[PDB]
């Protein structure tokens, strides 16, 4: 009549990758089996098992439940992607359209940490913001700085970087400096703050150390060698009479950690230098100097922005840049397009605070692939990729206000080129309300740390995109799950969703270990279920890490005083497969060898020798 606890556990471990205790499972039955006499015998009915997984609170994303990690925020500023806005003051087109002050408030409230002022002369000796030599409307500089002060730290107390595109006179550059000091007060970094900044080989300080701080990014006056050089240069200026090159000292003195420099290629220490490349120059840099660009971004910040050619405020794909460890990929937040949605999926991580620690191959020396990795290269023959299966089972209300459209689902794997690939289902004829596809895609991935899954709903007739969702691959939960879809403005569509299965396998050496560190392994929590543990319940749960090994798990189980080994068991739908586990073998590697929906469920068992 129904599913037992032992059998509901095998399904949850193997398909859903959730290790629940005897009691948490008795709870799921109590919550989904209405019939009390079933409930009293520990049996979930078949219609109740279906209700359990069809439930609206069976979401796909782990990022629903992600929050700031204090430790992950304790490394140098340059080890992080940093959510960034291009020409924040613009509402639409780059050469026409309005400037708005509020846009700084909206962007910063969202969790953005880098924003851009383009400062020009106002006819009354007060700096104004607008796109130079165009029909953009002008907004007051002061109003913008106040908007940033109010809203900078409402959503996230992690430091912002103000990108100043300085086109003012020296008189109005001094105004700018008064207003930065009077408005931001003790939040504005106006001096080197840390013991670590006066050390032999200095690094940028941690985004943690800089909570509730505002970093200016402007040009900084180069230090003159002697009194005479200053006076001689001054006599040169006088002698010939009959962005802006000059920099008010008042403003230069407020530039500390982010000293803008025309890009030098590949006397203030270099970790305080930062450069701003149009997308074309940054792409050239990524093709030509792949590994050098990665060694550069380990110690210094680099900022890319949209090409000048994109006058419609289109956006470039951020992946190229993030894979070379570029931190500030500055997008037009006013343009809903696939890249802005890629941006948003990236900065769901770490509580949406706007600082995400980089995949450790682009900074941690103890990563097997440190300095060997170029993301544009196909010859990864050293390593065995992880095998992903993704079933698109079905949808609900996938094209709002079009009951009679014919939808298919585009699924795009977006990562380094080698990991990239496109799928598309058959179109369901005239049913956007509860279409069923039950179509499966296989794909392999080497660099899990920066793949994005894009689900788009495409109305086959008009070929228009009606709903969309992007989710980091590592964020997708294994098993049967509901994927909340969103409209083309990345707003939640309260009823529209897809029902999906995903599976992951690991069969030279595995990629996820080649791209890992022993420090990240031992800090990644994983749960294991073990049957046959002396005790009341027939299976117990244990907290471990991706680094824990058979010998270590054995000590953890047994240490409490009353010749045992762990057994890898596969039970079929026969006689069970049984493999003794080697004392020095990684446990999580065994759980990731299993593949569900192949006629077995995996267990780990304690046995007497
Ligand atoms: Ca600009």
Author numbering: 1303 to 1544, 1638 to 1661, 1729 to 1969, 1975 to 2029, 2037 to 2047, 2056 to 2091
What do the study's own words say?
The phospholipase C (PLC) superfamily hydrolyzes phosphatidylinositol (PI) lipids to produce second messengers that increase intracellular Ca2+ and activate protein kinase C (PKC). PLCε is unusual in that it can integrate signals from both GPCRs and RTKs. The enzyme has also emerged as an important regulator of cardiovascular function because it is required for maximum cardiac contractility, and changes in its expression or activation result in cardiac hypertrophy and heart failure. As an integrator of signals from diverse signal transduction pathways, it contains regulatory elements distinct from those of other PLC enzymes, including a unique X–Y linker, a N-terminal CDC25 domain, and C-terminal RA1 and RA2 domains.
Thus, to understand how the RA1 domain is integrated with the PLCε core, we determined the 2.7 Å crystal structure of PLCε EF3-RA1 (residues 1284–2192). There are four copies of PLCε EF3-RA1 in the asymmetric unit arranged as two nearly identical dimers, although there is no evidence of dimerization by size exclusion chromatography or small-angle X-ray scattering. In each chain of PLCε, the first helix of the EF3 subdomain (E3α, residues 1284–1303) is disordered, potentially due to the absence of EF1/2. The PLC common core domains, which span the F3α helix of EF3 through the C2 domain, have a similar arrangement as observed in the PLCβ, PLCδ, and PLCγ subfamilies. The highly conserved active site residues within the PLCε TIM barrel are similarly configured to those of other PLC subfamilies, and weak electron density is observed for the catalytic Ca2+ in each of the four chains. In the EF3-RA1 structure, the C2 and RA1 domains are connected by a 16 residue linker (residues 1973–1990). Although residues 1969–1974 are disordered, the rest of the linker forms two short helices that interact with the TIM barrel and C2 domain, burying ∼800 Å2 of surface area. The RA1 domain (residues 1991–2093) interacts primarily with EF3/4 through a surface that includes the F3α-E4α loop, and also contacts the C2 domain. An amphipathic helix (residues 1529–1541, hereafter referred to as the αX–Y helix), is found in all four chains of the asymmetric unit, and a β hairpin (residues 1621–1631) is also observed in one chain. Superimposing the RA2 domain in the H-Ras–RA2 structure (PDB ID 2C5L18) with the RA1 domain in the EF3-RA1 structure shows that the predicted G protein binding surface is occluded by EF3/4.
